[PDB]
Write a protein that binds this ligand. Sequence first.
Ligand SMILES: O=C1NCN(c2ccccc2)C12CCNCC2
Length: 284
Amino acid sequence: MEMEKEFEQIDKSGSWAAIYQDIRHEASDFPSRVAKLPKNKNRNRYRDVSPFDHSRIKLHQEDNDYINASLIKMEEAQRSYILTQGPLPNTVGHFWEMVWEQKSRGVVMLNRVMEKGSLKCAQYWPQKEEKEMIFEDTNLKLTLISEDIKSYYTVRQLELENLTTQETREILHFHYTTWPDFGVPESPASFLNFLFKVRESGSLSPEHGPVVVHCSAGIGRSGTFCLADTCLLLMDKRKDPSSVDIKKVLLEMRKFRMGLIQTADQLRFSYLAVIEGAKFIMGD
Ligand SMILES: O=C1NCN(c2ccccc2)C12CCNCC2
């Protein structure tokens, strides 16, 4: 059955809130003891969003190895993602330390720095070529190389330098700039165009470390991005694309980070994105 037929019954039955609540009830509960240590209170944006101990990313330092970030490892799809919060004023140096240590090629940003009149994450990359950023706590330098501004997203070329070894790497910044301040996009067309641009860059490919993906909390929009990507990859691999169960993929991803998909509207949008994206994957 085309995932869309099923989509239609849930709309007519008006059962989005119902299914969403079922996911919330069946989701994994694992300890997050490191996130809750008193020394880490200013490293968390939200008191109720923490990485599990078993899947957290560790910083390579003896002082304090903690960052609010999780490794999502999808065994059948052969994809890995790091999902993290938007960086705070005192964790911008930790953020770039993680990108360096994990060998990531790409950063995917799904929020604006200001939304709803409030700050949703630090200004953590340079806005002008000639004004580079230095992170003294982690010994990194970050330079803006080029910027390509389009109607629905911006792509930036960044140079990250490990000041300790003088090694450099090219990082690509994929910034989706048009998610609305309230609700979800009316059409998934621009979100799917954006996902295909990240894939075309090589950022999601096994020759690199995992992509780093964030929004403000790193669970809602960030969850929608990895759920859509993995479901479309599984539809490309399986003899029967109709066997891909989006609810079962989401519960597998929730073994690695709590709270992925924050609302019934984000769940419906994820279904729409996968249904509309499949009309490319299956030969069009
Ligand atoms: O009864 C249900 N429980 C959940 N869900 C569902 C979700 C993902 C894959 C298959 C089925 C439905 C059945 C179809 N429409 C109503 C809600």
